[PDB]
């Protein structure tokens, strides 16, 4: 069999950049006759099916943008991005087809932007939760960047970081910004025996937090 | 128009079996080698088999991975291709595309179309339906403009949930985050922005569907959360 692989494992640049990205294969998929080697590449964006980007090594799919090359023979390749675009966000794979197909690991291309503020909202428990006992409190951080970011709970004043767990989207295709969620949950009995909730988003675009709350009492 | 359409998937138990089919339209289905690839979640692409075109003979031929225990089919009267798989484990938890391999060496290569995949899931755990939530505003307004709604989809098994807004009218200001597995039961949310002056004088429904419970929830957002 042969080993394919794909180096590096994820790579990030600014829109407008160009990029690089390698695959090697374990032996040659040159064939001696035809002269050719049986490599592609495909992209697959996230969330969605690959796309047939490149064949033979370094022919481009018709409809493909002239952005994507690819390159090589043998056993080593490369797929070059001139001037990467936000929509670029994606794995891309390489795939021998010299002897059945076999894929590599992917080389997972991130995108690098200015830094975004988020916007928070708060969500109290809906009605229809508190019929089944439970009591999540939603709050979501929409459209920022880096992705890194702190939330912090509040009920009452006091810290909350029981039951609380944060979820990030992948990074948008089109603004190549971050929205993450983070979800309290507690129990009809417990929610009901406080009043303020609060979920404080600390973020690098300041120093001072994003605070939203609402009472509960007030509801 | 080439399309491919999986179906099939669902939740199995360790060591059950299951088949898979591929409706194709639009290309002359017999000229064609067709092959099945997977993909973990999170994981990389695993290519699995393929059955050879009509001048080939319509041979089969399998990845080292699951050569004995999967098997590949295809019914050229009716245009559509199988995947059998037998003795399932955890490890085979995957979404499976069909796609449309070569036509012939000389021509070109590459897999140039791929159907949207289904999932299969291996567990010992059990289908359970999600109860979804719609999120409107507490009762405080703030500095008004734009409105962001949203529904909590909990409890349910296995995955995915598939949630949209007004049927995917509501595209682009939509965030649906990943689900998150707790004891045997995932949870997700998805959030929807709208200009104020359309919610809630205009109608704002998020679409739920969970596959594998044969399962589809409309929630619209009613005002007056809190
Ligand atoms: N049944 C086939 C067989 O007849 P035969 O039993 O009488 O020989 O072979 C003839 C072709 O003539 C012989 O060619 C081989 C050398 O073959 C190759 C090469 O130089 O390597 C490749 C041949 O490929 C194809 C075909 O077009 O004929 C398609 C191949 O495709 C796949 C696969 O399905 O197996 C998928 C593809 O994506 C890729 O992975 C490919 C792989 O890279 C090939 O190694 O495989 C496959 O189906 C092969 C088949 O396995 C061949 O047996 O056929 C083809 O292009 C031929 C040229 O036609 C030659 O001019 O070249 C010679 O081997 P040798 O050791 O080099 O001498 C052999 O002696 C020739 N008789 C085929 O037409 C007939 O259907
Ligand atoms: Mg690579
Ligand atoms: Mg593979
Ligand atoms: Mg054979």
């Known amino acids: 069999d042969i080993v394919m692989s794909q180096f590096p494992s994820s790579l990030a640049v600014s829109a407008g950049e160009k990029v690089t990205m390698s695959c090697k294969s374990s032996?040659?998929?040159?064939?001696?006759?035809?002269?050719?080697?049986?490599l592609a590449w495909y992209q697959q964006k996230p969330g969605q099916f690959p796309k047939l980007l490149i064949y033979?090594?370094?022919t481009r799919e018709s409809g493909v943008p002239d952005r994507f090359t690819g390159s090589g023979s043998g056993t080593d390749f490369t797929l070059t991005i001139s001037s990467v675009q936000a929509e670029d966000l994606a794995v891309y794979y390489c795939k021998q087809s010299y002897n059945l197909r076999t894929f590599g690991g992917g080389t997972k291309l991130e995108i690098k932007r200015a830094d975004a503020a988020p916007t928070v909202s708060i969500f109290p428990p809906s009605s229809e939760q508190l019929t089944s006992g439970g009591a999540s409190v939603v709050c979501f951080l929409n459209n920022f960047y880096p992705k890194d970011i702190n939330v912090k709970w509040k009920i009452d004043g006091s810290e909350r970081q029981n039951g609380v767990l944060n979820s990030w989207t992948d990074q948008d295709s089109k603004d190549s910004t971050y929205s993450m969620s983070s979800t309290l949950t507690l129990t009809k009995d417990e929610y009901e025996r406080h009043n303020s909730y609060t979920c404080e988003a600390t973020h690098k675009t300041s120093t001072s937090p994003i605070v939203k709350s609402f009472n509960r009492n007030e509801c | 128009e080439v399309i491919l359409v999986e179906s099939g998937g669902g939740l199995v138990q360790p060591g059950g079996s299951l088949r898979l089919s591929c409706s194709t339209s639009?290309?002359?289905?017999?000229?064609?080698?067709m092959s099945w690839v997977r993909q973990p979640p999170g994981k990389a692409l695993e290519w699995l088999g393929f059955?050879?075109?009509?001048?080939?003979?319509?041979?089969?031929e399998y990845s080292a991975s699951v050569k004995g225990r999967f098997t590949i089919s295809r019914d050229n009267s009716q245009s559509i291709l199988y995947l059998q798989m037998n003795t399932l484990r955890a490890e085979d938890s995957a979404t499976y595309y069909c796609?449309?391999?070569?036509?012939?060496?000389?021509?070109?290569?590459?897999?140039?179309?791929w159907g949207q995949g289904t999932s299969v899931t291996v567990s010992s755990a059990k289908t359970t339906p999600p109860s979804v939530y719609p999120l409107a505003p507490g009762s405080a307004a703030q500095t008004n403009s734009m409105v962001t709604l949203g529904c909590l989809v909990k409890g349910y098994f296995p995955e995915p949930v598939t949630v949209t807004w007004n049927s995917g009218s509501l595209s682009s200001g939509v965030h649906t985050f990943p689900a998150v597995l707790q004891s045997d039961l995932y949870t997700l949310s998805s959030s929807v922005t709208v200009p104020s002056s359309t919610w809630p004088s205009e109608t704002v429904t998020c679409n739920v569907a969970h596959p594998a419970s044969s399962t589809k929830v409309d929630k619209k957002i009613v005002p007056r959360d809190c």
């Open positions: 033979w090594a370094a």
């Open positions: 639009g290309f002359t289905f017999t000229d064609y080698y």
């Open positions: 059955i050879r075109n009509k001048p080939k003979g319509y041979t089969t």
């Open positions: 796609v449309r391999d070569i036509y012939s060496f000389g021509s070109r290569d590459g897999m140039d179309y």
């Open positions: 032996q040659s998929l040159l064939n001696s006759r035809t002269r050719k080697s049986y």
